[PDB]
């Protein structure tokens, strides 16, 4: 089974919390650290391409 066609829209995932939960801000601050560190794609490599 195989992918056909391109992706339809500019969408994505997000970490989520109850609205106004204290976790949302440190999560968001964490994400922009993880991104420049390359962790976000490194995990993707580990869980798609290395498998």
């Amino acid at each position: 089974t195989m992918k056909v066609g391109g992706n339809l829209d500019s969408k994505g995932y997000g970490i989520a919390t109850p609205k106004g939960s204290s976790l949302g801000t440190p999560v968001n601050l964490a994400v922009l650290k993880l991104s420049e560190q390359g962790v976000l794609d490194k995990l993707k490599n580990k869980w798609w391409y290395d498998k």
């Binding site: 089974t1 994505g12 995932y13 997000g14 989520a16 919390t17 939960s21 968001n28 994400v31 976000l40």
Partner: protein, 50 residues
């Protein structure tokens, strides 16, 4: 999340605007889109005139 059964969601739960009406999504960790899956095309004999 809404009914207090959990403190945070960490899963491939897709961002949608209607969900963010009741929860907060963070910045995304990657982009992706809707796609179609089918059984892949085969490899088979070219035409007689090939």
């Amino acid at each position: 999340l809404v009914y207090g059964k959990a403190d945070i969601a960490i899963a491939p739960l897709t961002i949608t605007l209607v969900r963010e009406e009741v929860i907060d999504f963070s910045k995304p960790f990657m982009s992706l889109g809707i796609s179609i899956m089918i059984k892949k095309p085969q490899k088979s004999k070219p035409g007689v005139f090939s």
